[PDB]
Amino acid sequence: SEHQAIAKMRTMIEGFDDISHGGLPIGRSTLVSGTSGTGKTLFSIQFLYNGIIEFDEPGVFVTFEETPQDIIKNARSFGWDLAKLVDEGKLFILDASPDLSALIERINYAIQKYRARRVSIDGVTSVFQQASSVVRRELFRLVARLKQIGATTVMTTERIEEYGPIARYGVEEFVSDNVVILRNVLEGERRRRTLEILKLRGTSHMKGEYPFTITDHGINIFP
Amino acid sequence: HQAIAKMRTMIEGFDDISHGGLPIGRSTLVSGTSGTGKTLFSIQFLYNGIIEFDEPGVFVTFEETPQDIIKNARSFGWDLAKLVDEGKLFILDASPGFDLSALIERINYAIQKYRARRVSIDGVTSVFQQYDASSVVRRELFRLVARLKQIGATTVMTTERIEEYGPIARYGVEEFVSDNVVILRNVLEGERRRRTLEILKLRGTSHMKGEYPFTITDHGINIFP
Amino acid sequence: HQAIAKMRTMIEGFDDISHGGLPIGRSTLVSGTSGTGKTLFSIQFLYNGIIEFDEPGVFVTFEETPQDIIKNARSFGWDLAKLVDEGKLFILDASPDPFDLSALIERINYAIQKYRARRVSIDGVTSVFQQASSVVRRELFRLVARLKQIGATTVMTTERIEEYGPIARYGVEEFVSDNVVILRNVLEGERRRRTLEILKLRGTSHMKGEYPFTITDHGINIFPLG
Amino acid sequence: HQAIAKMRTMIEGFDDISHGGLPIGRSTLVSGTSGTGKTLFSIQFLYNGIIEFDEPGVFVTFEETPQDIIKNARSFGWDLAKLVDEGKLFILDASPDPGFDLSALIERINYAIQKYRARRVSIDGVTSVFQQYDASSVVRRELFRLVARLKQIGATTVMTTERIEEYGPIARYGVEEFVSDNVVILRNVLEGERRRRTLEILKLRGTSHMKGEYPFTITDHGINIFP
Amino acid sequence: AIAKMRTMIEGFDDISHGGLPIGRSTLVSGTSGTGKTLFSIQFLYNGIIEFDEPGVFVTFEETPQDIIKNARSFGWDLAKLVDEGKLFILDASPDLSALIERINYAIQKYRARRVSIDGVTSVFQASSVVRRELFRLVARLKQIGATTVMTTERIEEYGPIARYGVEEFVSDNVVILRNVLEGERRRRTLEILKLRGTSHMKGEYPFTITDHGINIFPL
Amino acid sequence: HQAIAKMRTMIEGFDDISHGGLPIGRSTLVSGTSGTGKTLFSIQFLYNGIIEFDEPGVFVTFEETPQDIIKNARSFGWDLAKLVDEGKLFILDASPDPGFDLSALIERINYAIQKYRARRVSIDGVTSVFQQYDASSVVRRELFRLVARLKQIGATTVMTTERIEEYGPIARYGVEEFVSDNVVILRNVLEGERRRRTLEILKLRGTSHMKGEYPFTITDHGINIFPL
Ligand SMILES: Nc1ncnc2c1ncn2[C@@H]1O[C@H](COP(=O)(O)OP(=O)(O)OP(O)(O)=S)[C@@H](O)[C@H]1O
Ligand SMILES: Nc1ncnc2c1ncn2[C@@H]1O[C@H](COP(=O)(O)OP(=O)(O)OP(O)(O)=S)[C@@H](O)[C@H]1O
Ligand SMILES: Nc1ncnc2c1ncn2[C@@H]1O[C@H](COP(=O)(O)OP(=O)(O)OP(O)(O)=S)[C@@H](O)[C@H]1O
Ligand SMILES: Nc1ncnc2c1ncn2[C@@H]1O[C@H](COP(=O)(O)OP(=O)(O)OP(O)(O)=S)[C@@H](O)[C@H]1O
Ligand SMILES: Nc1ncnc2c1ncn2[C@@H]1O[C@H](COP(=O)(O)OP(=O)(O)OP(O)(O)=S)[C@@H](O)[C@H]1O
Ligand SMILES: Nc1ncnc2c1ncn2[C@@H]1O[C@H](COP(=O)(O)OP(=O)(O)OP(O)(O)=S)[C@@H](O)[C@H]1O
Ligand SMILES: [Cl-]
Ligand SMILES: [Cl-]
Ligand SMILES: [Cl-]
Ligand SMILES: [Cl-]
Ligand SMILES: [Cl-]
Ligand SMILES: [Cl-]
Ligand SMILES: [Mg+2]
Ligand SMILES: [Mg+2]
Ligand SMILES: [Mg+2]
Ligand SMILES: [Mg+2]
Ligand SMILES: [Mg+2]
Ligand SMILES: [Mg+2]
Incomplete structure (x- = not known):
């Protein structure tokens, strides 16, 4: 949709640009938080890699x-x-x-x-x-300085519970423009990966958790 | 004189829930987790005052x-x-400080x-x-609340919380020194999110109780029947 | 020389639950989360005493x-x-x-x-x-002992942050008070329900558990359980 | 099999639950939340001793x-x-x-x-x-x-303590039960907007007792415990 | 392969597959009045008498x-x-x-x-x-060649093995005495959580304390 | 070169769960409550290396x-x-x-x-x-x-650590899993009054592995894990 206030760049990560309604807001920082081995580094790399290749x-x-x-x-x-x-x-x-x-x-x-x-x-x-x-x-x-430079930034943070604080210090999501949560939920001895966009200032987005997998081609999200 | 009078927010559904709007000359605390619509609520309050x-x-x-x-x-x-x-x-x-x-x-x-x-x-x-x-x-x-009351401003002030069903705000005192408390929630259940608004208290006047579902749209906050 | 007497609050339903009202010459703790009706209870107590x-x-x-x-x-x-x-x-x-x-x-x-x-x-x-x-x-x-010397019958409000947790903030208030009333505002399934409980009245009897109440245009009204 | 001697409280039901009463020459901890009947138990224990x-x-x-x-x-x-x-x-x-x-x-x-x-x-x-001390x-x-000194005098002692949770620590500092010979817990449990008073003898060193919670009421006659 | 000494506490030697490993330390942890001291006493008393x-x-x-x-x-x-x-x-x-x-x-x-x-x-x-x-302490007792029962406290039936969250990691053997409340009734159970270098029965087994001490039923 | 290669543990079932074994030249954290089999896993890793x-x-x-x-x-x-x-x-x-x-x-x-x-x-x-340090x-x-120094020597390392809850933090200080390349969790869960041992590979950086918990027992032949 063109009728949204904030210009976005495409991650080209499959399913994410759908959930974010166009990709990541240009010139702003997006927090990507999760427990260990949720795919934070992979998301950050794939963001850069796709930007270069595409x-x-x-x-x-x-x-x-x-x-x-x-x-x-x-x-x-x-x-x-x-x-x-x-x-x-x-x-x-x-x-x-x-x-x-x-x-x-x-x-x-x-x-x-x-x-x-x-x-x-x-x-x-x-x-x-x-x-x-x-x-x-x-x-x-840091966020403000990156914005002044005009960079579009993904920054990762850690959390220790799947359903609890967004990040470690309970303040990270409040000073970020955009917040993405990667989860790796254990239930009945099985793990399932999900991605949620908690907030995007100045624009709409799909809500809640969406399943994804990590494969030989990186992150695949299915909204 | 009369019981406290109210200022219309013109936010769809809110003036119903609040039985007339926000108590005039007083501050209303609006608390919520990240991205619950606190800034939006604050902006819409001002915007509607100017336009309407x-x-x-x-x-x-x-x-x-x-x-x-x-x-x-x-x-x-x-x-x-x-x-x-x-x-x-x-x-x-x-x-x-x-x-x-x-x-x-x-x-x-x-x-x-x-x-x-x-x-x-x-x-x-x-x-x-x-302060911490x-x-x-x-x-x-x-x-702050006392000074604002002296000026006579009708005020919305936002605060943060980290849990949908825990403390009203960060330090466990904010709701007790506010005249009015509104709680915005963004509840995760079954992998879907459900936004709700609750008027917890309005000193010296009436209001509907509990949570009421709302959505954020191209026209701002929309509170459901 | 005999059992402690009570002073009527005339608060609709409370004198029944308290079996006569608040114990005379003593202080009653009224604890609750935000907007539970603590101030209203305290005011109605004085207001009814004056009017009645x-x-x-x-x-x-x-x-x-x-x-x-x-x-x-x-x-x-x-x-x-x-x-x-x-x-x-x-x-x-x-x-x-x-x-x-x-x-x-x-x-x-x-x-x-x-x-x-x-x-x-x-x-x-x-x-x-x-x-x-x-x-x-x-x-x-x-404070309690001093109010007792004066002969005041006192309502004293305190705060709590959970509906089903400590009686008040510091975990000691209820152990110092002669009498304890708990106001609750429980959120269940997106709906709020107000309840009042007389937890303790030293040296006298009272009904137990939570009793539903409402705040109306004429103050607190407390109803039979359930 | 030399049994630990006990003295009767004559608190209705308790001497049954305790199989004879309170261990003589020792201290019994009576812990509970606010208005659980701790002072009443303390007084009834002395009062019955005098009267009976x-x-x-x-x-x-x-x-x-x-x-x-x-x-x-x-x-x-x-x-x-x-x-x-x-x-x-x-x-x-x-x-x-x-101090x-x-x-x-x-x-x-x-x-x-x-x-x-x-x-x-x-x-x-x-x-x-x-x-x-905190x-x-x-x-x-x-x-x-304190317990050791009371034992030397040969006093049979009831001592009350506080707790802030019905099913949490025995007392405030998580240590009181470990230094007492005998532990009694008074509960005032809230379930479905209703209260239920219960008494439990958690432990009596060197002797037997009934286990778990037993319902009691407080009336004009003091504490009455039921099975 | 590892020599064990019999506690002769009814049922325990079955749960431990022969008794306590000789020359090792066994932690016996529990809330108040779970039978920790009784276990300690029986261990010595039976060793002497029998x-x-x-x-x-x-x-x-x-x-x-x-x-x-x-x-x-x-x-x-x-x-x-x-x-x-x-x-x-x-x-x-x-x-x-x-x-x-x-x-x-x-x-x-x-x-x-x-x-x-x-x-x-x-x-x-x-x-x-x-x-x-x-x-x-444990290391020294081991060098002496003593077989040791060591009691510790805990405040919850299900949670930390002992007070400081380290006791179970320095002990060779860990025994947990529980006194669990199930709808106003108490149920005593014993569990051997670990025995380094040997097998044992797993999970909780009910026991009672009677005039003849601890009575465990592993069935 | 290519993707990270793996070294076979020959521990029954584990090489299936890890899709080939432990990542060569790196450290694998193995965390668990008391008596979960951490030392055993560590020993069996070396013993199999020597024998096989x-x-x-x-x-x-x-x-x-x-x-x-x-x-x-x-x-x-x-x-x-x-x-x-x-x-x-x-x-x-x-x-x-x-210290x-x-x-x-x-x-x-x-x-x-x-x-x-x-x-x-x-x-x-x-x-x-x-x-x-605490x-x-x-x-x-x-x-x-420690992880970096071990990496510099080129040692394939199993490294045990502790936790106090079966379904709480991975280890004691809430940081161990974040600076480890690889994380295995051994659990010992109460099922009624019975116990159930499970092994989970939480993460392996730069490579694949099966997800979730898999039951295992400790027997006279050490750890035996059951996929399928
Ligand atoms: N080829 C692959 N096929 C499938 N899954 C893979 C593959 N390569 C990596 N993975 C998975 O991706 C995870 C690594 O993702 P990362 O992006 O490093 O996570 P992380 O959130 O950055 O975790 P940290 O930084 O170690 S706390 C591994 O644990 C595997 O589960
Ligand atoms: N046009 C729109 N349609 C639908 N939802 C929207 C639209 N514009 C914004 N939103 C939503 O509004 C949210 C932001 O609302 P805010 O009022 O800024 O929340 P907030 O509580 O102030 O969050 P902070 O200050 O960043 S912690 C976004 O995360 C979106 O979910
Ligand atoms: N006319 C009325 N009809 C119905 N409810 C009313 C009316 N006036 C006030 N209320 C309610 O009474 C509440 C205020 O009661 P208070 O006694 O002020 O509570 P409080 O526990 O003292 O809260 P604090 O001191 O602000 S934390 C408001 O939040 C309303 O819900
Ligand atoms: N005549 C009576 N009939 C019924 N219940 C009574 C009667 N007299 C007192 N009570 C009850 O006994 C309670 C007081 O018992 P106490 O022994 O003082 O409790 P407590 O544990 O000592 O409380 P503290 O010291 O204030 S924390 C009151 O709250 C009443 O519920
Ligand atoms: N003759 C007996 N018959 C039946 N049960 C008994 C007998 N003697 C003691 N008990 C029980 O055993 C308990 C005492 O066991 P202990 O081994 O002293 O417990 P403990 O774990 O050492 O508790 P501490 O040291 O006081 S925290 C008593 O509380 C009774 O329930
Ligand atoms: N022959 C055997 N048959 C079955 N189970 C055995 C056998 N030998 C040892 N075990 C089990 O293996 C456990 C010890 O495993 P370890 O690898 O030593 O555990 P651990 O996680 O290192 O515990 P720590 O270091 O003492 S906290 C014992 O508690 C037994 O349950
Ligand atoms: Cl996956
Ligand atoms: Cl919405
Ligand atoms: Cl009401
Ligand atoms: Cl009663
Ligand atoms: Cl028993
Ligand atoms: Cl096993
Ligand atoms: Mg990473
Ligand atoms: Mg905002
Ligand atoms: Mg007030
Ligand atoms: Mg008392
Ligand atoms: Mg002992
Ligand atoms: Mg070990």
Whole structure:
């Protein structure tokens, strides 16, 4: 539908652009939260990968724990050659894994250098465990700075319960424009993966949980 | 004199539930989890005052920028920038302990300058979170409510909560120092979401009880029979 | 020399449940979540005492202003300003400008002597308590004992955050009080149901469990169970 | 098979549930939420001792005044003031006038026990003093030494404690039951808007007792327990 | 393959497939009045009466006098055994290593093979400290070659095995005594949660406490 | 190269559930409440490596003494003493003298690895030194460094940790699963008055696996898992 207020870019992730009514809001950050092994990193990568392959939009991936080499190695599970894209200057993996102000400028520099339209930030809450009010302000500053740059950003966060707080510090969903929840629910000894778009400021979207699978082709969502 | 009188919100179904609207000269707490429609409720309250009654409004925002408020309001067919240019709406940027005492006098300037009868305060929780102490939150919120009452503004103020059926708000005190409490819920059941609105209390006047289903549409909040 | 006597509240249904009303000379805790009717109960207690028995009352407010108290009471067709003007009611403002327990108690005593009040309602003492469970326990204990010396029959409101959880905020209030009333506002299947319970009345009898009630244009009405 | 001796409470039903009454020369913890009948159990225990057996009793109170104890007991037609005048009952007042010392309190209790030649003791409100210790470890050791001292005097003691949940911890600090020889739990269970009073003997060291909850009522005659 | 010693507690040796592993520590955890002390006592008493294996009982809160008096209700004369030198009740009711040394001395002096440690949880006021202290105690008893029953407390029937959430991880063997409320009735059950290096029956088995001690029915 | 390759555990049913075994050169976290079979899984991993593929193994123990490990494995008919005597299995006692330095341990581990030419490593009881810290942030960082150091040596590692609830957090500090590449959960669930053991592979980074819980028993031949 054209009659929505916020311009969106397509993830080209199957089923997600339907649920989000067109993709992710351009120039804004989308929180992607979930328990362990829910597919947060995969979503973040597939966002960048599809952007490059489909639209030749350069991407910057910021990682806080997983090494660039593990990211590249793990992506081969889906037939994606990220090293080749890194070689072409179409993908840049920014290694922030051994101050958030200095980091923001590193990202800013990479975005300008590589002319990136899409940004994924994976594992930023590992920097918080280092108070909810402090988390809230720092995230708020990061989101605002990314917006001023004009980046369209996916940022992952962690949660420890399938049905409970959106993320660890109970403030993350409130300073984000957009919130996506990945679940991996255990019921009667079986797991089922779901994705929910909890909110998208300024636009409609499908509500509730929608089933998805992770396969050799990445994330497949069925709305 | 009379029992407290009410101001019509013109939000479909709400004036029915509230038996006339929001109590005049007082603040109404509107609490909910993330993306429940709190900002929308606050905006629609002001927007309807301007369009339907030519009552000017002041919107106070703590985190969301004025430009984003305006842009997001276009989703509901509302041209806030036009209202700002006509001087019928003023958006006060409260983004950066935080001095709520200094803030309220800036709000007063705007109220007097634009002759506002309706005020919406969105995101005061972000300030309360610095406090991170129930006793301080209670005291500061009490003073804020008291100062607003002195001005005579009819006010909607939003707050956050983290559970659909737990505490009214974050610090377990907000509902006790508010005259009026509205709870917006976004309940997940069987993988589907169901939005509801409840008027928990209105001091000194009557209202319908329990939860009432609503949806958010291209025309804003729509509360069902 | 004999069993504790009771003072009638004239609150529709309560004197039945309480088997005569509130125990004379003692304080009754009325606890509830937000908007359960705690202030209304406290006010109706004084209002009925004035109107039915010509017993003067003192209302102590810690947050809500006297003006608001009066304004909100007009919802029930009650003219509190009149009762204040006639010297039958005093609203004692202990609320802060937009804590000394001893100073407050002497003000209450002064007011009780000045207006010859037999009934007292204290609304919002919780707000000063939040400024340690055992500090709260000791302060509350002292307030109760002091009111007892004066001979006041007192309604005292407190807050709770769950319908089926602790009686009040600090887990000690009910153990210090002689009498405990719980107001509930239970949400079940998107519908709210108000109930009143007399949990405890020291040295006397009372009906048990929850009894449904409503708040109407003329105050609290309590009905038979179920 | 040498049995632990017991003394009868004469509280209707209880001596059946306890198989003879309360273990002699030991302390029995009586825990419950608000208005569960803890003080009533404490008083009825002393009152029956005096009336039925001519055994003097000492009631130790920490919050409720002797005058209120006496006043409230008239609800059941008991004249405690008369018993105090006869020296059959002594209400020891430890209530505050508007870190306390145990050793002072116990020597008071000890003196009162010796003076009135009391065989039964009820201690009511000791939780109030364990509440700004407000530390489980501290409460445990202080309560332990209190029990040990009472045992030396040879007093058979009922001591009340508080709990804030019907089916949660035995008492406030999760330690009180572990340092008591005997534990009784009074419950006031709310189910479907109705209340149900129950008494349970959770444990009696070294002796037998009936298990689980038994319904009781409080009437003009005090506590009446049913099977 | 692992040698076990018989508790001779009715039904228990069946549940443990032959008794408690010799030279190992067994945690016996439960809420108040679940039969922890009774289990500890029977373990030593049976070892003495039937196998002439001396025992040491270590008590932290309950006095030796009360332990003796309470055991008498089961017809067990512990005073005779302590006077015969077959049993030693170590009053640890006045520094864990000072305790350890006293235990060791008693074991050596009385040539004890069974040890019951009852109420060690009262020593603690930090889970890491508790874990470290308990591990040292267990390790030392193992080096001595003692077979040990060690009681601990819990506050809920279903939840943490013991108070500090570490006790079950430092013990070789874990036994849980439950006293579960089912519609106003109590039901006693015993469960062996783990026995390192050997098999055992799984889950809960009902028992009663009678004039002859613990009576477990594994059927 | 391509997708991450896997090393066969030869544990009955597990290689089916993991679609080929444990990811080579990486650590797999194995979490469970008390007596769930974590040490057994760790031992059986090394034992099968030695017997089936002649791949030497190193077992790092933080609590159980080496002799207890050997003695406890005898109920499964595994002669671990012989394997130690042959130099095929090295048990590394990492218990502190009856707070901890990871880099010192990695050296001892690395040395043992080179010396015994070990393909497989099991680390059992590292949670005990994590409690010394009692801070999720500290635990998270320390574990992260352990995983990275182990990766640098190229060891395929089983790493046990603890939890106190069958259906609560994966491990103690709520961070362990997030810095691990691979996560296995052993459960021991009450069914009426009976117990039911289950194994779940929660995640394996960069590769596939079966989902949910699968029942297993512990017998005289160790762990036997039942898919289908
Ligand atoms: N080829 C594949 N086929 C099927 N499932 C796969 C495949 N490759 C990976 N997966 C799944 O994808 C998961 C990894 O997803 P991730 O995106 O790394 O999750 P994550 O939320 O980032 O978890 P973390 O970062 O480790 S907490 C694995 O646990 C597998 O379940
Ligand atoms: N045109 C529309 N049609 C339907 N739903 C819409 C439309 N526009 C917005 N929404 C919904 O409105 C939500 C946002 O409403 P808000 O009032 O901003 O909620 P909120 O409680 O203020 O959330 P915060 O401040 O981000 S925590 C979005 O998440 C959408 O679900
Ligand atoms: N005329 C009326 N008819 C029906 N209900 C009314 C009327 N006037 C007020 N009420 C109700 O009474 C409630 C207020 O009762 P209060 O006694 O003020 O409760 P409260 O427990 O003191 O709440 P606090 O102090 O604000 S937390 C309102 O929320 C209404 O639901
Ligand atoms: N004559 C009576 N008939 C029936 N019930 C009575 C009578 N007298 C008192 N009661 C009940 O007994 C209760 C008081 O029992 P108590 O022994 O004081 O309880 P409690 O556990 O000591 O409460 P505390 O100390 O205030 S927390 C009252 O709440 C009544 O429900
Ligand atoms: N002769 C007996 N006949 C029947 N049951 C008995 C007998 N003696 C004791 N009991 C029961 O056994 C319980 C005491 O068992 P213990 O082993 O002392 O419990 P415990 O777990 O050690 O509790 P603690 O140490 O007080 S927390 C009593 O509460 C009775 O229920
Ligand atoms: N021969 C056997 N037959 C059946 N079950 C056995 C046998 N040998 C051991 N077991 C079981 O294996 C369990 C021990 O498994 P472990 O791997 O040691 O568990 P664990 O998770 O390491 O527990 P910890 O470290 O003590 S908390 C015992 O509790 C028994 O239930
Ligand atoms: Cl999947
Ligand atoms: Cl909607
Ligand atoms: Cl009503
Ligand atoms: Cl009753
Ligand atoms: Cl039994
Ligand atoms: Cl098994
Ligand atoms: Mg990831
Ligand atoms: Mg908003
Ligand atoms: Mg009120
Ligand atoms: Mg009492
Ligand atoms: Mg014991
Ligand atoms: Mg192990």
